Ligand SMILES: *[C@@H]1O[C@H](CO)[C@@H](O[C@@H]2O[C@H](CO)[C@@H](O[C@@H]3O[C@H](CO[C@H]4O[C@H](CO)[C@@H](O)[C@H](O)[C@@H]4O)[C@@H](O)[C@H](O[C@H]4O[C@H](CO)[C@@H](O)[C@H](O)[C@@H]4O)[C@@H]3O)[C@H](O)[C@H]2NC(C)=O)[C@H](O)[C@H]1NC(C)=O
Ligand SMILES: *[C@@H]1O[C@H](CO)[C@@H](O[C@@H]2O[C@H](CO)[C@@H](O[C@@H]3O[C@H](CO)[C@@H](O)[C@H](O)[C@@H]3O)[C@H](O)[C@H]2NC(C)=O)[C@H](O)[C@H]1NC(C)=O
Ligand SMILES: *[C@@H]1O[C@H](CO)[C@@H](O[C@@H]2O[C@H](CO)[C@@H](O[C@@H]3O[C@H](CO)[C@@H](O)[C@H](O)[C@@H]3O)[C@H](O)[C@H]2NC(C)=O)[C@H](O)[C@H]1NC(C)=O
């Protein structure tokens with residue numbers, strides 16, 4: 001997964017120089033199938049975003065972390081992006 | 097033969113600031129040295145491997161800063177919901193907890209702390225049009241990026257850091273310090289504050305007699321903290337100093353390229369435009385050596401500063417663990433006087449501690465004696481000393497004045513009345529009076 | 532002759548010793564109450580009694596053997612000077628730096 | 629000569645950091661041992 | 677089933693030494709390098725900051 | 726342990742670089758050049 005730091009991925013074609021790179025980077029320069037999502041530090045390319053929150057494994061920055069999934073039923077072998085979880089929530093109330 | 101015993105007390109709140117972390121940076125050799133030059137890139141490759149060490153050191157520094165921040169702030173893995181009411185037995189917890197009126201996720205004091213100290217360049221979201229690709233006045237930040245110098249954002253955002261402080265402050269008002277050693281234990285704040293007075297050698301009854309005065313003094317001190325912060329601009333100095341040091345180091349590293357050392361010109365394009373490669377290699381070599389020396393000096397200074405910040409962060413984490421999640425009897429470790437409780441507040445690249453202490457005042461003059469002789473036997477006090485008015489005798493505390501009659505359960509009996517010096521005639525109350 | 536100079540410290544030797552004199556004198560008059568606020572006068576015999584109380588020993592033992600404790604304290608203080616005179620390795624870190 | 633000066637400055641900085649740590653420890657010991665009584669083991673000598 | 681209890685005490689005084697500070701120094705480049713030489717001073721100025 | 730080993734290995738392997746000279750090996754430099762010309766080649770290696 002390639003993270004283009006300090007750029008808006010709406011303007012990748014005017015930054016990555018698509019016309020002067022190999023087709024492999026042309027794959028990582030197009031917004032198809034939700035492969036580009038804007039984060040606080042940059043815009044990650046080549047990974048899928050997920051809801052909820054898990055413990056951080058691969059630090060990225062600005063509260064975003066990454067992990068690799070090995071799925072056989074869904075045939076998923078990509079990288080996930082998510083927001084780290086602060087911790088579990090308690091329900092202690094005040095009484096006099 | 098005299099002794100001074102205080103008769104009044106006051107509640108004082110003090111502040112303390114400790115840096116926790118600094119900025120994270122990265123350096124690219126192929127861009128800082130030999131900018132857009134294939135021949136110079138080949139020469140640098142021929143020079144040797146003198147750049148992997150710099151990248152490894154910078155990565156280690158960044159990881160160390162992230163670890164320091166996590167260790168200082170993230171200590172308890174339990175988020176406690178902020179109570180709806182912010183008045184616990186007269187104590188006003190309004191300027192320490194976030195206001196639900198606006199979802200700012202920060203307290204009133206933290207906003208002032210953030211606005212008091214400025215930052216060089218936040219966001220790290222500068223694109224073309226915001227640099228010389230568009231229009232600028234040649235800002236420093238775009239000049240740094242033109243030579244491979246970049247600044248990485250921290251792993252934890254400002255909102256996430258304030259969540260830890262909100263959880264820590266809320267947990268104290270609901271359990272005290274029992275949640276630090278295990279699970280939370282609910283307790284009324286009035287009873288919780290009573291045992292804080294018990295740990296400093298003062299009896300529990302004094303708090304219930306003057307609860308309103310204590311609450312008023314606490315609220316007044318909390319309110320005056322904001323006024324003191326507003327009226328001054330020198331308390332938050334360390335964070336500004338470290339930010340300025342990092343900015344100055346980066347700017348000096350950027351501007352060091354103007355020097356040509358022993359060559360004929362600082363620019364590399366003109367050297368290759370007028371000299372053959374056999375003669376241009378000598379000119380390029382000295383520039384390469386000088387730039388590598390400057391990079392090495394910068395890396396060494398950054399490593400030293402990182403070590404200092406690591407020591408400061410370790411001290412801050414120890415103070416947070418031993419002063420917020422418990423009560424410490426160490427002298428001058430949690431302020432001036434007798435420590436009662438502490439409140440953590442988030443600061444940019446640092447942390448602010450609010451220490452609540454107990455300070456006696458309004459001394460009074462009294463006389464004292466070592467022991468008391470009742471009948472051929474000496475009696476020694478258990479908790480306190482002997483005081484005297486107008487040919488009388490009483491037993492009282494030291495941190496507070498509260499005379500009581502001398503009884504057999506307040507003094508243990510040991511020895512005779514001859515070895516002890518200063519002992520005087522006195523009677524002892526007999527418990528068997530109504531019999 | 533080569534631009535190398537050494538600057539004197541801000542605080543002189545006499546001023547530094549004043550702090551030590553104030554600290555030692557304050558202990559003999561108030562113990563440690565002056566560190567947390569204002570000074571509190573107290574007899575030294577009673578002040579030393581509660582020092583024995585903080586280490587789990589009862590207060591009565593000090594008054595029974597005050598003379599022995601004072602003699603031992605004076606002997607140790609006197610022997611400190613002899614030990615310092617007879618040796619020359621205790622003050623090593625300052626010489627090293 | 630510039631290299632020698634840089635080496636001297638770096639060594640002085642390291643020694644200054646070490647002296648700073650030692651001075652912090654000494655100040656903490658002075659605060660916790662002279663202006664009060666400490667129950668920490670082997671922090672103010674041998675014994676109680 | 678046994679226990680040892682001391683019956684006497686002694687007062688001992690020990691010493692401890694901690695460094696607090698070191699000497700302060702200053703360095704002049706124009707004197708240490710290029711001592712009394714205008715040409716060398718100009719070359720050092722050209723060298724950089 | 727890994728940091729110390731890596732530092733030692735990097736220090737050992739740093740000798741392969743010839744800096745601005747013509748060869749990393751010192752035997753061949755003295756085998757083809759006069760001392761007046763070989764001193765310049767040796768100086769940069771020594772400094773590096
Ligand atoms: C140092 O501080 C102590 C604090 O206790 C003072 O000691 C008390 O001093 C007061 C004032 O002199 C004494 O009060 C007097 O006591 C008598 C009544 O005692 C009754 O109650 C006790 C039990 O508490 C019984 O043992 C006793 O038998 C009685 O039943 C009377 O002499 C006095 O009454 C006068 O005042 C009242 C109220 O104003 C009037 O209604 C009466 O008409 C009359 O005028 C008075 O109440 C008290 O006994 C002392 N306590 C002790 C333990 O001795 C010291 O005086 C003070 N020293 C100085 C120099 O200030
Ligand atoms: C010594 O401690 C006592 C309490 O044990 C203090 O006495 C009371 O202190 C409170 C402090 O708020 C005073 O309240 C104030 O009183 C007036 C009322 O007109 C006014 O200034 C304020 O609105 C407030 O209510 C209270 O009056 C006072 N009581 C007496 C009898 O004086 C005392 O102040 C302490 N001493 C010192 C020097 O602080
Ligand atoms: C155990 O503690 C007791 C006291 O609780 C010590 O007993 C007394 O110790 C003092 C120490 O100064 C002795 O004083 C000396 O005695 C003679 C007098 O001729 C002389 O050596 C000195 O001039 C000094 O005055 C005192 O005699 C002694 N009492 C007895 C009955 O022995 C005791 O010494 C302690 N034990 C040890 C082993 O130290």
Ligand SMILES: *[C@@H]1O[C@H](CO)[C@@H](O[C@@H]2O[C@H](CO)[C@@H](O)[C@H](O)[C@H]2NC(C)=O)[C@H](O)[C@H]1NC(C)=O
Nearest residue numbers: 006007008009010011038043219220221222223
């Ligand atoms: C990246 O581009 C996107 C798409 O243009 C921007 O999204 C909006 O940008 C406008 C104009 O700045 C803002 O007012 C809106 O709030 C943005 N969001 C939405 C949902 O409309 C985005 O801001 C751009 N990022 C940067 C840093 O310029």
Ligand SMILES: *[C@@H]1O[C@H](CO)[C@@H](O[C@@H]2O[C@H](CO)[C@@H](O)[C@H](O)[C@H]2NC(C)=O)[C@H](O)[C@H]1NC(C)=O
Nearest residue numbers: 093094095096181183184185186284285286287
């Ligand atoms: C503890 O809190 C409860 C509420 O959780 C208080 O109960 C109130 O008591 C007053 C007494 O005048 C009633 O008028 C209210 O209707 C009660 N409920 C509420 C929601 O306020 C209780 O009084 C508190 N205890 C103390 C000692 O203050």
Ligand SMILES: *[C@@H]1O[C@H](CO)[C@@H](O[C@@H]2O[C@H](CO)[C@@H](O)[C@H](O)[C@H]2NC(C)=O)[C@H](O)[C@H]1NC(C)=O
Nearest residue numbers: 468469470471472473513514518519520521522
């Ligand atoms: C403390 O009280 C005792 C017991 O009464 C006093 O000892 C006696 O004092 C009387 C006078 O009150 C003398 O006549 C006796 O000879 C004393 N007996 C002795 C010394 O065995 C003792 O003096 C009192 N202490 C004082 C007044 O400081």
Ligand SMILES: *[C@@H]1O[C@H](CO)[C@@H](O)[C@H](O)[C@H]1NC(C)=O
Nearest residue numbers: 048049050051052053082083
């Ligand atoms: C994931 O979150 C998005 C954004 O709120 C939401 O639209 C989507 O339904 C969620 N998917 C789930 C909960 O499976």
Ligand SMILES: *[C@@H]1O[C@H](CO)[C@@H](O)[C@H](O)[C@H]1NC(C)=O
Nearest residue numbers: 098099100459460461462572
């Ligand atoms: C206490 O009273 C005594 C009586 O002799 C006097 O000398 C002393 O100065 C007084 N102390 C204070 C602090 O007023």
